[PDB]
Design a protein around this ligand. Sequence first.
Ligand SMILES: [Cl-]
Ligand SMILES: [Mg+2]
Ligand SMILES: [Mg+2]
Ligand SMILES: [Mg+2]
Ligand SMILES: [Mg+2]
Lengths: 226, 244, 241, 196, 195, 231, 243, 204, 250
Amino acid sequence: TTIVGVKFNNGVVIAADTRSTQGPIVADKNCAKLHRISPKIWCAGAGTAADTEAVTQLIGSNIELHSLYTSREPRVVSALQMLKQHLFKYQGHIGAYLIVAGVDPTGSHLFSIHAHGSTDVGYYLSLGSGSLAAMAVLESHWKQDLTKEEAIKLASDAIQAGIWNDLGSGSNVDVCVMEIGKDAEYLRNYLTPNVREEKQKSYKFPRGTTAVLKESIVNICDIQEE
Amino acid sequence: GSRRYDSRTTIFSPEGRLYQVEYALESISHAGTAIGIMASDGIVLAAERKVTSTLLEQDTSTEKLYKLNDKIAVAVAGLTADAEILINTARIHAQNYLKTYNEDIPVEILVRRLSDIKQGYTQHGGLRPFGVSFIYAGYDDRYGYQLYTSNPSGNYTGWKAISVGANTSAAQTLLQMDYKDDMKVDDAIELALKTLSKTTDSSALTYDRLEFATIRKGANDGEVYQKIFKPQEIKDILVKTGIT
Amino acid sequence: GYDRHITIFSPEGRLYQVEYAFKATNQTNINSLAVRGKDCTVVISQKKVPDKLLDPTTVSYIFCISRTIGMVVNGPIPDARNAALRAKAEAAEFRYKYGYDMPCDVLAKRMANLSQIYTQRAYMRPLGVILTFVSVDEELGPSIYKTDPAGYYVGYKATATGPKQQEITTNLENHFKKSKIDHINEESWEKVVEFAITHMIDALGTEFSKNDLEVGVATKDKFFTLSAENIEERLVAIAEQ
Amino acid sequence: TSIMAVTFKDGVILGADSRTTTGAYIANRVTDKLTRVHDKIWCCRSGSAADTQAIADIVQYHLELYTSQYGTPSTETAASVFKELCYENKDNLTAGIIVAGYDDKNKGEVYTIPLGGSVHKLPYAIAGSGSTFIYGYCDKNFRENMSKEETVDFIKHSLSQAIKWDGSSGGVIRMVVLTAAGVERLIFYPDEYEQL
Amino acid sequence: MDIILGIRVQDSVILASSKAVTRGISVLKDSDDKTRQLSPHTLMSFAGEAGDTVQFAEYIQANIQLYSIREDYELSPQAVSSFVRQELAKSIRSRRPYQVNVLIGGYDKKKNKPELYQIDYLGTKVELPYGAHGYSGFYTFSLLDHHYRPDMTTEEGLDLLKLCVQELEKRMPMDFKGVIVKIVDKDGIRQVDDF
Amino acid sequence: NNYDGDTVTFSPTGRLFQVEYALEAIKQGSVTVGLRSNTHAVLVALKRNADELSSYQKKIIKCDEHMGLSLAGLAPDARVLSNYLRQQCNYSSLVFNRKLAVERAGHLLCDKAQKNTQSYGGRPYGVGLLIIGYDKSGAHLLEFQPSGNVTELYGTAIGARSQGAKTYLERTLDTFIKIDGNPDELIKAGVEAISQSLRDESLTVDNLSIAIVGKDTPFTIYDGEAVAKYI
Amino acid sequence: TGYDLSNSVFSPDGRNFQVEYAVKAVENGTTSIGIKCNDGVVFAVEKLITSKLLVPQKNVKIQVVDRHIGCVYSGLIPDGRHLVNRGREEAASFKKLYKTPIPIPAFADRLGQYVQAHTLYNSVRPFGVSTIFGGVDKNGAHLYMLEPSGSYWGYKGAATGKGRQSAKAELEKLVDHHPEGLSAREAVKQAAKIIYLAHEDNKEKDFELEISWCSLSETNGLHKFVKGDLLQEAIDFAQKEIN
Amino acid sequence: SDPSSINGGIVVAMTGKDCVAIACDLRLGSQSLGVSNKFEKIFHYGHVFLGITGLATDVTTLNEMFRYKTNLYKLKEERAIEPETFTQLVSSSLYERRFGPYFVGPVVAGINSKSGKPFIAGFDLIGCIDEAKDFIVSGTASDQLFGMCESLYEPNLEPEDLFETISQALLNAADRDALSGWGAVVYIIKKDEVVKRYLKMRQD
Amino acid sequence: MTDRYSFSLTTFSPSGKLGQIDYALTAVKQGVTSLGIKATNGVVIATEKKSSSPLAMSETLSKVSLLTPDIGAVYSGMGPDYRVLVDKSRKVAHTSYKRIYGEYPPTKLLVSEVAKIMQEATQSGGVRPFGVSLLIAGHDEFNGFSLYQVDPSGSYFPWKATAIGKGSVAAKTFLEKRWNDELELEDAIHIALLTLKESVEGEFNGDTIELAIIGDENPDLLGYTGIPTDKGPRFRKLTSQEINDRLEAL
Ligand SMILES: [Cl-]
Ligand SMILES: [Mg+2]
Ligand SMILES: [Mg+2]
Ligand SMILES: [Mg+2]
Ligand SMILES: [Mg+2]
């Protein structure tokens, strides 16, 4: 997994690859690692995939109820505080490593969180097995006062570094841009640089190739009238 | 302290009656009449909705007839909200039994469980009893088609034909007169509707004031089908039996 | 007639214990007033020290709940302090859990929900107090939210509480009918306090010395109370025009 | 970590590096280890980042609630609340915290709370992995009642050496000055302190 | 304990269980009956850790007997086996799990069919024509795979069972002191006293 | 009247009737006397029988080697309170290697009785106690009421007709306080004190109960022929 | 009616009658007072000698909390002891967590909230005591008086019990005649006088005087009982004034 | 010792044109010992199909649990549960046992009754959803299944062509796994007809 | 302390009446009128913002509340009781549904959960019934648009159109004459405004009337783009201006 977050002029961008693995095997080639906590607060997760979604949905659910209770749009610091306290209580056993980003009435924010409950603040961050490849690109090309177009370019370049150089990461680049005073735009499969080439041969079988013992209609309908 | 304000819901009268149970039964006597009739080839459940309106959405409405599982259904007479609490408990018990034994719960076992829950509220806890009487219509492979009733005391009994709610004295006399053992479902449908038509406090019995259901082995071969009648289907059976 | 002793419905659909808690509210015989400026929210309250043996510095019905939120109470001091301690605890817990300062309107809602519970649960009595919360909220700006024993709460342009609330209310109503705006159009909080004291003097028909009043002021990022000498400076400015 | 707090004539100054490590990888090179638990009571954190952030958040909550009831807490009181958490949860925590604060009555004070959860009031304190390399330097160069400029130089030179020898320490040197005048943040970059 | 076998034939279920009980060094008993009658037409044999086996079997017996009295009705073999599986499936995630493997042989009076269920300590249930637990299947299944027919008589089933026990007595290192054999059919449960 | 249904209710004049009714149980109880000098402390108790076939109800309970009490009222309540004292005396010895001060024992009894006067559901204790003891500050005598009020005294009496013995002790105050190093004379004064409360009946061998504690005297109870010497 | 039968019930006035009945028990008790001096506080109490058999100086009424707070009360003595026991727990936990000894205003609220809590439910009875308490902290001397309702304020002088009107009048004279303040030793003398003067409401039985004090100069900010020569000097001063 | 490979077995699911297919082997074993050749691993609740690999006791337990839950769902909702909704229920149910999990590899397959859209999904033992367009695999021969499906699969196969593809994927994968085989079943699922076919395969 | 009221405060009287529920209904009768009308392509719920003081900012008091993105609620009776029910209803929609099935509950089932809470306050120890009647409007994929009434007893009924509170009897008669099964949403809003005018004494404008609809999906109110299947909430509260525009065509 490679995930990054980059601050820019009027907001923040997060990005991620789309490969999920079971040891050395690729379970899903087009995984969605950018999760929504609230409309304008999004986070990307690395580590135990069930933990990163479970913890994102629980906090996202409680954030929604909090937003309704207070009649205010949710804040990133609220999501951060609720995530870290939950993760600290479970002493690292919930293996969620998150980059939390968003915009709220206070402004634009970017934090990382780690399974034990440490949090950090940054203009650029990376997490996952491909974080060192991504951080190399970020440390080479990051500057202050980036534009929106520059930040998307930098973020996707950092994910590409993870895709090509880290075996844990691969396939496509997902992006989500959160700008102040605008709707958050989720760009699913922003880059697609890993389409499989056409195969040499068709493996469609002649009908009747497989040996069959018994055939029967399965009753999926309910008990019938009359 | 707090003792001052305690009604003491679970005590005997000098005559040996449970005050709250008796008063809950008085409440149920004002509820819409519900009738159950058992035949050789099925069971009929008929029930009257209480003084409705033209602006009530009938096709999505349910206040009398509830499904407990695929084989068992209940007709309600009393506080609807109290009934839904018990109905959900009964639905869970049926599923617990199915998970444990991998067989559908026998009708009497379900009825006994709900009745025992009602009993508890009369003996301990200091809470008011449930103001609900049920008619249970169900089928299992041991006793076949069965009708039961339970009331707030937690006592339950089996029936060939029975009524609960308003005008049960009049309704039970009419059923006792026209009921025969070799009766069939189509005949029982007619008896149930005729009985409600005579006992009702309304001016006339129409489709919008009724809920209707049948449990038939009129399901293709050895199996049982529950049919909760739609508004148009209640309108048709009223014309067929010659009431409207 | 035990429907009058605990919080259950009477045949008229009324809760008498809640109604009697409203009557306890005026037991102190103190009137309070709250108004909003451009950048601030001001709350004033009468101060009465009837015993010479009392230490007058400890007699107060204005509370500093958090750095940003202030609260004035109309009702007996035991119930006032009960509500104060709880509000302080709730504000602190909120900041810890959600990472930002509890808004004035949200605290008001929370305390109102707690009050609602006392009207429904029999073992708990209502508190005989009316709580007026003030702050300069970072999102909503100057804010006045008031809670009562029924569990009711609402925002206010300005408000008044106590035995003579109606006189003060009508006085404030008439001013805002003229100006046609939702606040006191004034830059400094000093002049907004002067407006508040002046309009209380007009409504009640009584003059005040420095020891007859109690003042609280909410600005951006802090709520504070004025000393007797700060109030004296305010009273001098009123008299000189 | 390399952290220290030093009392001087006008109050107290806290100092720290900015490096956070998971192993040999620097997970954050611009970390802020100087943390505010009250207006003029700050702390320096070393050990598990999760543990010290959890502790500092709880202390900040405790002192906020203390202030609402009893007014401004003393530095001794803040140290006691830190100690209570570190001592009672010693089996499950890895935290080494230095508490520094300014009263008007007590002026600048420094308390150090090592692993066990004990408290030690000192004229100055050093902690973190890098502190081992500057015990000699600090003992020789510390004087009581230094000026602000002298104390800034003492901390700058001290942490400079700690950073030079400890791989776990590095980045910028952050400082927070606590006096009657208020709260001042300072930062010193590598090109400055490396040539000292 | 050690060897427990089961075979379902045309009109009955036959359960065979060893008689030996060994306390490490010595054989303390050579006549032990590793079975309990759950209901008139349902028998359960068992093998596993000492103490837990009997404690579990008697606990199940008590529960099925309680059900029989409450409802005045005998549960089907399928229903009993499901109840037993759930108890073992519950047990496996307990503080201290029941280390007990069972075979349930019953005659369903409604369907007029014999039924054999094999359940291990984890709560793994399978309906089988013939079954075993432990190492018993390793020696006997190749014989059962060859000779078994669904239309076998009870006498043919006993003969095929003798061939299985003979192979066990030849190739197993442990002396299990023979087996007690019991038949479950429409008339109930009986013991073959000469085997 | 309307305010005596439970212990959680004050009357309009600020009285607690359930506590006052518990106090009334003590007045129905048999008389018991307590008095002390500077070296010793003595309890004298008139035991009450049900009839001529019955035994005489025991009145004195030992709490430690250096402490004990006499009771008047509900005997089972005295058993509960004396058991609590036994435990507290014992906690002090085991944890602190310290004999429990008589004054501190009074404070503990007061607080235990108080909790039963302020809470719903419970009831006040229906017994009065006279605690004697010898600790590091010499001889002591305490009087416990189930309202919670505990008082340190030179001498006192509780139970039916206790006013006669209390007046006698009030006269003799200057004499019996000076009886130092003479246990027999101090008991004589206590037996003469309790005699001012008798009517129709007199002190017999199975009627009289005496206890004593002092400088070099563990708390010991005398019954039967052991008190014939003082009759 | 029936509003006065249960605690925590509001009457149609908005009054808690049970709390008002608890005040009657306070008014029935012996007189106790408190005087705030220049650098501390003085407490005094009237102890009625019911009989000659009472051991002099032994039945101590004034109680210490922590080492810097004194507490005295009028009304049901056991209720007061229960309140002090809670106060001692509150002061212990405060010092445990925050290190510093509990400030007097902080301590005042702890007692206040606890007493107020006994007016919220019908399962408990209100406290039948008014408690005068105080001491010295980092911000100086403080004197408080706490009622059955949970109500408390700071005081220059305070009095409660059967002779409270007499005492209050005497305290008001001291406030007027000493705007600059009263010394600790003066306050002990004055406290003795006021109790002797307030004893006219309890003139049937004779009494025993008991005094305590906390002073920054005289006791180092610790609570101590006035004993021996200083107590006798105050008794003599008091006896001289009544004659 | 490893709970997920004591009993053995496999499940595979595929999408086609207006159809889905789900298939499983029939083996249950005790490590090396083959115990049953009739242990089906595919269940259905209305028109939603669920395959479960892994520890057999948990396979049985979860089937009974989801039957329980989908039956209560139907009574309250007055409609059959859909594949998308059921997928979330499986995920929720598995994650509630985060620190004491069922050792299983579930696979959901079905067609949404309202939109007509084919749907498949997979899970790890702890609830993480893998919702692929093409195919889902599970069990002790998942590696082998990934290899077969990746080469044999093409999009928009007709029901009768999809049958051949999924059957050959299962069979050849199972023959390279010691703990899978002993028979196989294939479900072909269309919007309102489902056909079930038992396959002839080597019995070693 | 401890809650020592573990017994029912609502009990059957000799006549079979549950007194406390009846008295709760009496409180609802005194409450301000609220109504709901169902159209073919939407539902409308409306009420009067009875301001307690002109100094009070009545925009800060919400009588019409969003429960889920596709479900809204309005009440008649005791405001505080309503507020806490909305809190509980919002939470139960998550805990007993969204955290299980990953989607918001259908209208009828959320109503069922609210009803259950109201029933329990009618039987549990040491509590009184809620003094409110709710009108809950909502939409879901398989049931379409719907409107439900929930009473203090916990009973609930589905309606085509209805009214509760002060002038409900007259309002329901007015609705019976105007309602048909071919109404478009705009027609239903028009009828809602006509009906509500009869029960209002003083000012009748966008600032004194609170009105919300359950209608088309609002992608503009979603807060993000990029997921085709997420199209936005069907609940929308009408603005003061939007109400006044429809009062000119009245
Ligand atoms: Cl709340
Ligand atoms: Mg209440
Ligand atoms: Mg370095
Ligand atoms: Mg194979
Ligand atoms: Mg093989």
